[PDB]
Amino acid sequence: QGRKIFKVFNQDFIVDERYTVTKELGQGAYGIVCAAVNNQTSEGVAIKKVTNVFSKKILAKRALREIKLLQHFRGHRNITCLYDMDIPRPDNFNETYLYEELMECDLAAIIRSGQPLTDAHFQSFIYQILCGLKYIHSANVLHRDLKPGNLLVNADCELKICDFGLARGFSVDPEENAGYMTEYVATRWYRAPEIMLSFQSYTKAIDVWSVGCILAELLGGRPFFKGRDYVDQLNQILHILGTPNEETLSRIGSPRAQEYVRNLPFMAKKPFPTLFPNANPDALDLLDRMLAFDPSSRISVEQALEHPYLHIWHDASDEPDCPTTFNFDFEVVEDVGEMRKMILDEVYRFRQLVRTQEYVGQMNDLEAELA
Ligand SMILES: Nc1ncnc2c1ncn2[C@@H]1O[C@H](COP(=O)(O)O)[C@@H](O)[C@H]1O
């Protein structure tokens, strides 16, 4: 066997025999999470059990999507790092276990606790998000669901992006781009406006908007655009940013939505210095550029990394790209028998993998020479 059984969240939890489960960490619609300790090296790990993966066709394509993407982004300082995977009962399995680097809480919890944070904290948090996002975008991947709940933090307040279940491809070819699949809908409070206004402009700007929502939530201690439905969400956004111009209005690809926005009374822009009168002026200037209503005027990731707000942290020699792009050919598969085969292949191939001029060089060549 080589495995142990634990009882957590009123179910079974089958782990490698080298570990001991220690604490429950939470639930979701997609699995349960516990913390553990390697009884040998003493390092801590988190163990995530994806549940009921072959109950619906959409849960199965979600798990395969997350498995492949976590492998593609291993080894970045600002992305959660996958260590191992395991399928305990391969004959009739309906779950897979992921072994990941262990963190302490998420950013939503820190904001909820009311613990005081300085402006240097805001700078560090926003810079780390942008470094991880630049890596992801360089592989032509859109995250699509950035928010404080998907950002893990530890005691040193280092930050790591997680949860790739909603990610989607991007291509400069608009026929290629129009063909990437979107199984689920993102969290309403952080979703960019051009998605519900039918701009047909699914670009990397959709992730930049979410980062702006996060900086605004940090500055006010509470979510910034907090709609109860989509109409309420649109009203709260126009109330802050104001009536759009004629170019922007014509871009609304939906007739009922364009008719509604065109008929509202005039609304002036509320300047961010009036909403956060005690904040760093550089913070509000970057906030204004990330929360641009029209995606064509919105700041890019690389422009944001160069903004004066972040000049202490910025070092382009420390902000890498991903070596290769990610391929989304698997999402075409629509047979659940094929998807069980692909998942088994991913796990066994990964398990085998993880178990496998400067001055000194110039002087070594000169020494072997003189000798
Ligand atoms: N690598 C990790 N380290 C520590 N806690 C985590 C980790 N991944 C997820 N969690 C937490 O486990 C819970 C489950 O979240 P979910 O990703 O929705 O299943 C949430 O409270 C997360 O913040």
Swiss-Prot record:
Reactions accelerated catalytically: L-seryl-[protein] + ATP = O-phospho-L-seryl-[protein] + ADP + H(+); L-threonyl-[protein] + ATP = O-phospho-L-threonyl-[protein] + ADP + H(+)
EC number: 2.7.11.24
Binding site for ATP: 25-33, 48
Domain Protein kinase: 19-310
The protein's required cofactors: Mg(2+)
Keywords on record: ATP-binding, Kinase, Magnesium, Nucleotide-binding, Serine/threonine-protein kinase, Transferase, Virulence
Family of this protein: Belongs to the protein kinase superfamily. Ser/Thr protein kinase family. MAP kinase subfamily.
Stated role: Mitogen-activated protein kinase; part of the MCK1-MKK2-MPS1 MAP kinase (MAPK) signal transduction cascade that is essential for cell wall integrity and plant infection, but not for plant defense responses. Beside its role in pathogenesis, the MPS1 cascade is active in conidiation and cellular stress responses. Targets downstream of the MPS1-MAPK pathway include transcription factors MIG1 and SWI6, as well as GSK1 and MPG1.
Protein name: Mitogen-activated protein kinase MPS1
Lineage of producing organism: Eukaryota, Fungi, Dikarya, Ascomycota, Pezizomycotina
